[PDB]
A paper describes a structure:
One such enzyme is 2-hydroxyacyl-CoA lyase/synthase (HACL/S), which catalyzes the reversible cleavage of 2-hydroxyacyl-CoA (2hcCoA) into formyl-CoA (fCoA) and an aldehyde or ketone. Originally identified in the mammalian α-oxidation pathway of 3-methyl-branched fatty acids, HACL/S has demonstrated remarkable catalytic reversibility, as it is capable of condensing fCoA with various substrates covering a wide range of aldehydes and ketones with different carbon chain lengths. All the enzymes are tetramers, specifically dimers of dimers (α2), where α2 dimer represents a catalytical unit. The three domains have specific functions: the N-terminal domain binds the pyrimidine of [name] (PYR), the middle domain has a regulatory function (R) and binds ADP, and the C-terminal domain binds the pyrophosphoryl group (PP) of [name].
Author numbering:
A (entry chain A), C (entry chain A): 8 to 550
B (entry chain B): 9 to 550
The structure:
């Protein structure tokens, strides 16, 4: 009789499902699950809070293309990751949250951390089940991987009773499950593909919009071939920057407000008409704007704005279908058209207004001058993590991306507390790749001590914090008042000394020449670092 | 005269007795905090929603009414689910005010539009979304009502973003009267007489004092009950202080002895949960008789049959119990071998703990580092203890003398409440020292919140025990390729982290340095952190 | 080794907890639970739908004073009783819903009737747990009885996996639990009791209101002693009729709208200021009305109207406290007061306006003439079940009750589909007692075939149906139109022939003389019967 306990079955089933990384904080009763995960070949990363650990999991999934894993303590441990769990649902990102629970033999006794935690994750989960039998653990894991990756992706939660985790059983009595296949791709209806190309030919002022769904579909080659073979100006969403290099000739990112107001037809590829795109409604949009939609979630069609031609199914497959229809006709939107001309004139004018602020040298620095140094020195093959308000917002314009899936921001949920998790998760998915984590001072405080994880594991992560006074730029005079500012934080805080105390490199760049040197020094360091950037609390946030 | 929703919320809270609000502002709740300050509510801006909600629980437990937390829509509200549940686990009232999508933007994909109401229902005494702007004082008064009355617990109030900023004539607003404080209920006189009749027949009785006595404000009656009867009493972790821990009838030094040999147990304001080992063997005798006093009738007879059960306010019931004792004048014998054997096991176990407190080593141990804290902890200071052995051993070494002066993980064993409890305790008691003892694993959950104590200049002194992470980890464990799953940087300088945020820093590598570090930080008119590198192989047991 | 299966442990634990009756529809996997219940001493009643079976359980609890039990099939069986489960929550009535579920070995396989049914009952349940271990079944049952009876009473749901129900185990390994005690009574704060009597002495035009909470507290003797020793006119709620005999000299039931508008102070004993009492707000109430409240749920105080003196705790104990304060002073509200005089004059005038309609003889009958015969011939020791709209509403005025807990209506939830369940449940709790189930034709259709249960078990239940045209009185001309009436039902339906086909006695009373004879004939029958009463579709519903 060769025996095996529950925690080994969990870890072994995860490894058989292609899981390579796991994050979380150990404790009762999940400590052995992490120990078994390291023995089974899954690298464990001990975080300091369950919230960024869950964000690290979904980052590994989005970047790696398979599934990331988070481990949480029963009771308050699992419930501390509800927001990060919902963020994976808002962005349609798969993951697996593994959490302990009360022992079956201690149900209704007042057991340690005994609580109803299934109901808190169910409003956002593709899969939320409590293990009922020890010999069926691989089935629960296979079903968790299946519901999270297939269909519309989303987070999965697998609850494990405390007594099942430590219980042993003969190995031959364990019902193992085969590897859940990777998501399959569907072609769109050829009648809808022919109608989509037909509607584009009749468009007077068209505009292509590329969303993060194209990134998840790994359709960077096809979306560029479509944008280039049609000659239509495109507009990349925040996390779609990089699929097509942001310096492309047809990029309307500098004329975003212009192309969204004057477009008579819009090709919405892998994006949603949500708050990010102003719901496609006036005043930001043309009242009679036509919509061609490509989204493999059929429930997203015609939301807010009616869809003239809807194409559900895989973006990469449908883009290849649309290209074959284009190759049949050899069609091309006129290059000399005043639409491309008026968009180019609007883009260059707005780009020069941004160029004016970027060349403005100040001490303390401003948004555009500080972000200019990052854009100049960001490795094009690095991963850029941005979190905050205007710090994250303006970085969308200044910081260009040139490679697919190299930028991570707050996403469709606008969440705070994911910067450290995404950076730690990105560095774990790509061992040697450099990670730049730009954050505001307000965003940094949600998980500030997580920098120690980058020291304990020696991760090449470079943090850059804009201390402008907290949630918004608060002048020093506001803190002298009796009632301290509501969104104000210590203007004189030295987050580099915070990183220094945790065991990492420290930099306090107060001008452009100091920020230039502090960045290139942090890049050459084979480890973590934080560059404190005291920001002007009155810095202009518009060009 | 017009008024918007955010002002109505703040004015209603002020009318209900709310005096503090901890939150992280943002769309669409930023104006609520500003209105809270204009209506006379101290708003303490935090850096994360989880410690902000834990701070609201501390204000309620210490203040006696209701603390308030303000959360951003979507991720903000869902960042405090564990803290919201911790208030339910400890039966503590509070109010989590959260924004949400606008009513005009429902089913559009609005910013942070999500079902956050369902995530808090499993633990909420009240979870409702505002539907009418003019009815906000009704929603607030009903949130205060459900949280305080009955078995206390948290309440969640969801507010649509458009209602927060929508204006209306003030005369068209339905203001609600001040919700009264919870009423008291008397116990059945027949049950009270049987409880006294059961104590007389007990040969080895034991009183167990729980945090319900603290919530009941019954510290005067529970001490008058232990002395009138002469039974050795035992206080739960957060019950330390109701009766001063140096009482001549405290069986804390022989806890395992009294729980394993008592023939009868008087359960006051405590539950037979994991903390009390469910009242079951081997920690307890299988034939132990239970006399229970808990105003939640659903808690009687749990795990172990309750012989005589008394529901009703502990303070009022203890008055009945004393009134029945004042007739016969009965008292347990002083020379009884049960009290003598308890004193024999107690004075012996205390010597074993005292022996470990005399061992000076470099780095410091648990008992040596906790000895310097107990010698200098002022009796009228709020002591916050978070972690594993750091908190567990502090229940033994650190002494409490005033009622409701210790805050720990509670019945939920939650991690991430240390900073919030300390910031909430300092906000509740302005001119009062606060000591936040944390392990290095517990500190990382919300370490950046020390800047809040720097921003508001709170008299909070953090003390961190860096022993290698979640448990003691030798430096040799970090040299392997696979890093330890519960390990954290042994060389981490959390005092330099505090210095970077704007607070006083201290590093105590021995007992003499810790003695000077504590006495110095206690005289600082602001926050401070004492980093105590601990022996990764320190003695956990006496 | 003396073995025992799961279904026997459930039934034996229920019998040890004082459970005597069980209702429901058998099937997979709960059939053996009913068979074991009959062998363990619990009488099983096979219903035809899970909705009235659950209503029968809460009726047994309210009438018996302990706990009634309902048994439901997994999946759609349990989910068919969600409304009846919520009704027990709306009325603060205890019960236990026992339902099967998917086997643990078949979780996540698509098992027969596999579904998440815990989440549907949790918004209303005091206890909703799925059994996780076989040897701990008595603990689940003891905890279900405990949370349902103690504190604020309410429904409890106990889910049982299919494989645990049939699984056997050594009897010595079964962890049995002792009997959960009956609810304990609490005295109110003597400071609040002294203030309540103090406020009543200052009342100029007081009014006592007796709710069904006094019935649950079994305080019929104390509430009468208080109403009589204070001399204050009282007002009994619909299901509070009978605690004090409805022909009492101080009953203001005939002047309800008058006493609620002119009362300067109201003693709310065991009742809630909900929709039934017009929320205590104008125009139905005095704007500055003072409120003295007696409700052992502290969360109900000051709702809608502020409470001047609140007294939580047991009603019977608090009423005994208030009586001792009255006996100390010998206080009495003036009998000669114009308040008692104006209420008496208003009551006799309204009673005579009702007397006019009751003496009106018509064919088809009207509401007041048909209900007059029921009031004349209703046994004062029988149980009167009323369900419907005006049929149930007007019966509150015409049909008097003289004994505590003899009337059951729709309750605080206004639910339909409880008439048959309450009648069947009442006849099961009291074996030989006669039950009169008055219903409208619309109410009768929710569970019409349930009359067969009264035939199969030979229950002394007399059904009386008012066929007035459906949900409201619809004339025969309305059904001749193209669009059939929205709330209209067959005016010519013969529900007595429906009962006759099911095996019971039948009567079709079309006038007063026929209704008088049909009632007294149905009373002498040692079994079920239905009296069809074709009602005037234009019958006056107001005096
Ligand atoms: N592989 C895929 N093929 C096609 N569509 C996809 C794929 N993956 C995701 N999507 C779609 O992309 C959409 C994501 O849009 P969203 O992330 O809101 O846009 P944005 O990039 O502006 O945030 C989802 O609705 C999803 O249905
Ligand atoms: N005023 C009161 N009177 C009686 N019991 C109370 C009162 N307030 C709270 N309680 C009870 O005290 C119990 C708290 O138990 P618990 O917190 O587990 O004890 P501890 O944590 O101190 O061991 C709750 O079940 C609650 O019902
Ligand atoms: N034994 C009892 N002692 C005191 N109050 C009780 C008791 N049982 C129930 N109640 C109270 O009576 C109230 C029921 O009122 P309700 O049924 O709405 O009034 P009505 O009779 O008008 O329907 C509940 O709020 C409950 O708290
Ligand atoms: C969990 C969570 N809490 C709160 C918010 C609200 N929020 C959005 S951005 C932000 C902080 C913005 O400040 P910072 O990062 O310093 O940016 P800057 O002042 O440089 O623009 C906050 C609190 C959120 N999105 N998520
Ligand atoms: C929210 C939450 N996550 C995780 C845990 C599990 N847990 C219990 S104690 C602890 C930390 C113990 O470390 P530390 O405070 O350094 O203690 P020490 O080394 O002194 O024993 C953790 C993570 C918890 N109780 N709550
Ligand atoms: C489950 C449920 N469905 C519907 C209703 C709405 N409802 C209230 S009374 C009633 C029927 C009233 O008709 P009837 O009993 O014939 O009375 P009458 O016309 O004699 O007044 C209905 C459908 C309800 N209360 N509960
Ligand atoms: Mg900032
Ligand atoms: Mg530690
Ligand atoms: Mg009808």
């Amino acid at each position: 009789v060769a025996e095996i306990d529950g925690q080994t079955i969990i870890a072994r089933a995860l490894k058989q499902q292609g899981v390579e990384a796991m994050f979380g904080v150990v404790g009762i009763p999940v400590t052995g699950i992490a120990a078994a995960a390291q023995r089974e070949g899954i690298k464990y990363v001990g975080m300091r809070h369950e919230m960024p650990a869950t964000y690290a999991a979904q980052a590994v999934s989005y970047l790696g293309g398979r599934l990331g894993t988070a481990l949480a303590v029963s009771g308050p441990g699992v419930l501390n990751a509800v927001a990060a769990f919902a963020n994976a649902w808002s962005n349609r990102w798969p993951m697996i949250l593994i959490g302990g629970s009360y022992e079956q033999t201690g149900h209704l006794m007042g057991f340690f951390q005994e609580a109803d935690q299934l109901s808190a994750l169910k409003p956002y989960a593709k899969y939320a089940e409590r293990v009922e039998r020890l010999e069926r653990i691989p089935i629960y894991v296979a079903e968790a991987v299946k519901k999270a990756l297939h269909g519309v992706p989303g987070p999965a939660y697998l609850e494990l009773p405390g007594d099942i985790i430590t219980a042993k059983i003969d190995e031959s009595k364990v019902e193992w499950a085969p590897r859940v296949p990777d998501p399959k791709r569907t072609l769109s209806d050829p009648a809808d593909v022919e109608a989509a190309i037909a509607a584009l030919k009749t468009a007077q002022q068209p505009l292509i919009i590329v969303g993060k769904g194209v990134a998840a579909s790994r359709a960077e080659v096809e979306i560029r071939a479509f944008v280039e073979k049609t000659g239509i100006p495109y507009l990349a969403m925040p996390m779609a920057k990089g699929l097509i290099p942001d310096d492309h000739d047809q990029s309307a990112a500098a004329a975003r407000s212009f192309v969204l107001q004057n477009a008579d037809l819009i090709f919405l590829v892998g994006a949603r008409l949500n708050w990010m795109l102003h719901f496609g409604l006036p005043p930001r949009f043309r009242p009679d704007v036509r919509v061609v939609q490509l989204d493999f979630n059929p429930e997203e069609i015609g939301i807010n704005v009616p869809t003239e031609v809807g194409m559900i199914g895989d973006a990469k497959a449908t883009l290849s279908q649309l290209l074959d229809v284009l190759d049949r006709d050899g069609w091309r939107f006129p290059d000399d058209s005043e639409w491309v001309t008026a968009v180019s004139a609007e883009a260059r004018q707005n780009a020069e207004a941004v160029q004016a602020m970027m060349q403005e040298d100040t001490q303390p620095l401003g948004y555009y001058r500080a972000l200019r140094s990052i854009d100049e020195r960001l490795p094009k093959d690095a991963i850029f993590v941005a979190e905050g308000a205007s710090t994250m917002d303006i970085s969308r314009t200044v910081i260009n991306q040139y490679l697919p899936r190299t930028r991570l921001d707050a996403g469709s949920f606008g969440s705070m507390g994911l910067g450290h998790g995404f950076a730690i998760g990105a560095a774990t998915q790509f061992p040697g790749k450099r990670v730049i984590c730009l954050q505001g001072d307000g965003a940094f405080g949600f998980a500030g001590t997580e920098c120690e994880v980058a020291v304990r594991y020696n991760l090449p992560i470079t943090w850059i914090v804009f201390n402008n006074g907290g949630i918004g730029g608060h002048r020093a005079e506001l803190f002298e008042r009796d009632q301290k500012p509501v969104g104000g934080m210590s203007l004189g805080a030295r987050y580099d000394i915070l990183m220094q105390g945790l065991g990492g490199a420290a930099f306090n760049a107060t001008n452009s020449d100091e920020l230039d040197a502090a960045i290139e020094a942090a890049l050459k360091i084979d480890g973590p670092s934080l560059i404190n950037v005291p920001l002007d609390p009155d810095a202009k946030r518009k060009p």
